[PDB]
Design a protein around this nucleic acid. Structure first.
Length: 279
DNA sequence: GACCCGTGGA
DNA sequence: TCCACGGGTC
């Protein structure tokens, strides 16, 4: 049976654009749209030179680079490479046309999965090694729906401990009602569970979990009321479109690549980006 | 110095 | 508390 005591830290990339998103997301998209298509060499130079206008002249090159690769590149999936040329992604193209930010993040939540090609290779191998396989946002949404169906409300710490840091859940072995019943069982016994790591600061334990919830909120699919996570039923149709895939294996199969192969390694990251960023 | 994440300003 | 710079460790 479901045992959440098997805990597993499974990160997503650390954010850089939340505080200024309403400025940075248009800037990312406009920069990429303007300067692409171009060679990788030009991309790096012109992107950084345009972004520094938004972030401030004292921004280091390292920070501009990290914005480019970690956020515009991996996490938000805003460009991709084919041959030796960089192009705007399908997600970027759509946003250029509709300016729809909740749609942008709905698409991110729909496609997000563990394992993925955003992570460093060694981290990929860890997550594959632990047999992780989940579409976490469909899963989170179904957990929230099942909690409502059973007349209980979940906290961020509940989602953190029982879902996004639970090995068995992340392995796709667990039904949302199992999670809900366990939570009810624990609560009756006066047991409240939080994600904890010895000697570590809260950001280590929780930032990637909170930020995953942030992207659901940016997608307009949930609200956060104090420590509580609540569904936005004004978006009930969109909630159900995503939640329905809670029990599906990841659309992108990380497990068909041999990471000891130089060619398979390159394909992994190329195939991931294609799946995640484009139509 | 290309994600990871310690660290501390906001 | 939140979250992102930029050094860390690929």
């Amino acid at each position: 049976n479901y045992n959440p005591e098997e805990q597993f830290r499974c990160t997503i990339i650390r954010g850089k654009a939340k505080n200024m998103l309403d400025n940075l997301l248009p800037a990312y998209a406009n920069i990429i749209d303007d300067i692409c298509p171009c060679d990788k060499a030009s991309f790096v130079k012109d992107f950084n030179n345009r972004l520094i206008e938004i972030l401030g002249e004292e921004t280091t090159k390292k920070t501009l680079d990290n914005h480019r690769t970690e956020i515009a590149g991996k996490l938000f999936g805003m460009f991709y490479e084919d041959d030796e040329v960089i192009f705007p992604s399908g997600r970027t193209n759509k946003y250029i046309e509709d300016s729809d930010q909740p749609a942008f993040f709905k698409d991110i939540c729909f496609k997000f999965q563990f394992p993925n090609g955003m992570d460093k290779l060694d981290k990929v191998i860890e997550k594959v090694g632990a047999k992780i396989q989940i579409r976490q946002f469909p899963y989170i949404l179904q957990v929230l729906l099942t909690a409502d169906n059973n007349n209980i409300q979940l906290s961020k710490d509940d989602i953190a401990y029982y879902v996004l840091n639970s090995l068995q859940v992340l392995q796709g072995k667990i039904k949302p009602i199992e999670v809900i019943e366990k939570i009810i069982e624990d609560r009756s016994n006066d047991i409240t569970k939080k994600v904890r790591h010895p000697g570590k600061e809260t950001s280590y334990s929780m930032q990637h979990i909170r930020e995953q919830l942030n992207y659901l909120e940016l997608a307009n699919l949930i609200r956060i009321d104090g420590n509580l996570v609540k569904l936005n039923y004004r978006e009930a149709e969109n909630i159900n479109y995503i939640a329905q895939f809670w029990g599906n294996k990841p659309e992108f199969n990380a497990y068909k690549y041999d990471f000891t192969s130089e060619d398979d390694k390159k394909s992994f990251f190329k195939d991931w980006q294609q799946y995640y960023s484009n139509v």
